[PDB]
Amino acid sequence: QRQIQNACAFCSKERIENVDLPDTQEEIKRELDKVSRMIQKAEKSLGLS
Amino acid sequence: VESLRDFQNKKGEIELHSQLLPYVKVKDHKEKLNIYKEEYERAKANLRAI
Amino acid sequence: DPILKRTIISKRKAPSNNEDEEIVKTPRKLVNYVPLKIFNLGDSFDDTITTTVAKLQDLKKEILDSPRSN
Amino acid sequence: RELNQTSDLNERKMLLQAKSLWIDVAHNTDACKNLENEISGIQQKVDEV
Amino acid sequence: MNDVIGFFNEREADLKSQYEDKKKFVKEMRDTPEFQSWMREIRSYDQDTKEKLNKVAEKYEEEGNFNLSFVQDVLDKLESEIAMVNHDESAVTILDQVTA
Structure with missing residues (x-):
């Protein structure tokens, strides 16, 4: 219930199942690292937070 | 220009593990094969003993 | 034969017989569940900071709905 | 407007991280179901005893 | 003893x-889909033997090491390298007419 409360705090858990993503946790972690890196690139292009 | 050159270097580095066998995957396969073989050996030794 | 393939490959007899723990399997409790697994990979980037970011995103979109200039 | 462009990718990172959290929730729920099945079998053995 | 032998x-x-x-685990450890992916990576490398690739x-x-x-x-x-190539091009x- 702590995890589901976090999910309902982070938008909603029930709106998640419709989106498609591989179930493997390693692939999702790699995607999270990739999006973090590209967010860092966008930030450094903007310069200011 | 230098970013294109570094991208060429990156694609060369990717081909390094891609053109040959995947080093990470081959090492993991060797390790798992070793552990499975040793487990099989100890299991068959125990079976023969019993 | 290229030294590359033999160096990349791993010799099967290289491990020292891969001896297991002690002589037999370690003793275990009759239940010994210990679920834990609070986090399953991921971690790294926090979710609360980007949650505030997304809240600010929808707030600034709502501001964009409000008139600006003119 | 540049921030909106960056925040599109930021909310994409939201989508990815929320998928990760929901899959973690799913793993926890299925492990809980497995534990429930195990305790149900143990309770059936207890009833037999 | 009958109990203990049973x-x-x-x-x-x-x-x-x-x-x-x-x-079964040993058997499935070999003949994997990744093992199938192998022996054609070797072919791809054999299309371009040694020389610069060896270096x-x-x-x-x-x-x-x-x-x-x-x-x-x-x-x-x-x-x-992916993060590096993210900001590229x-x-x-245009590189020439600006110089001209």
Whole structure:
């Protein structure tokens, strides 16, 4: 219930199942690292937070 | 220009593990094969003993 | 034969017989569940900071709905 | 407007991280179901005893 | 003793089942889909034998043994090069007429 409360705090858990993503946790972690890196690139292009 | 050159270097580095066998995957396969073989050996030794 | 393939490959007899723990399997409790697994990979980037970011995103979109200039 | 462009990718990172959290929730729920099945079998053995 | 011999019979049956499971694990460890992916990576390398590829492979081997890693180092380098190439081709459409 702590995890589901976090999910309902982070938008909603029930709106998640419709989106498609591989179930493997390693692939999702790699995607999270990739999006973090590209967010860092966008930030450094903007310069200011 | 230098970013294109570094991208060429990156694609060369990717081909390094891609053109040959995947080093990470081959090492993991060797390790798992070793552990499975040793487990099989100890299991068959125990079976023969019993 | 290229030294590359033999160096990349791993010799099967290289491990020292891969001896297991002690002589037999370690003793275990009759239940010994210990679920834990609070986090399953991921971690790294926090979710609360980007949650505030997304809240600010929808707030600034709502501001964009409000008139600006003119 | 540049921030909106960056925040599109930021909310994409939201989508990815929320998928990760929901899959973690799913793993926890299925492990809980497995534990429930195990305790149900143990309770059936207890009833037999 | 009849009880203990029945118990040892069931114990050795369980050991036989575990040994069969380990044999199945060994069998599935080989002939993997990744094993299928192999032997054609070798063919791809054989399309372009040695020469510059041998030199860059030697350099890669030196980097890998110097790094004292083979999985974390490779993944880190892949992530770094992807992040690098993310910001690429900035106003690269024109290089000559500006100089002219």
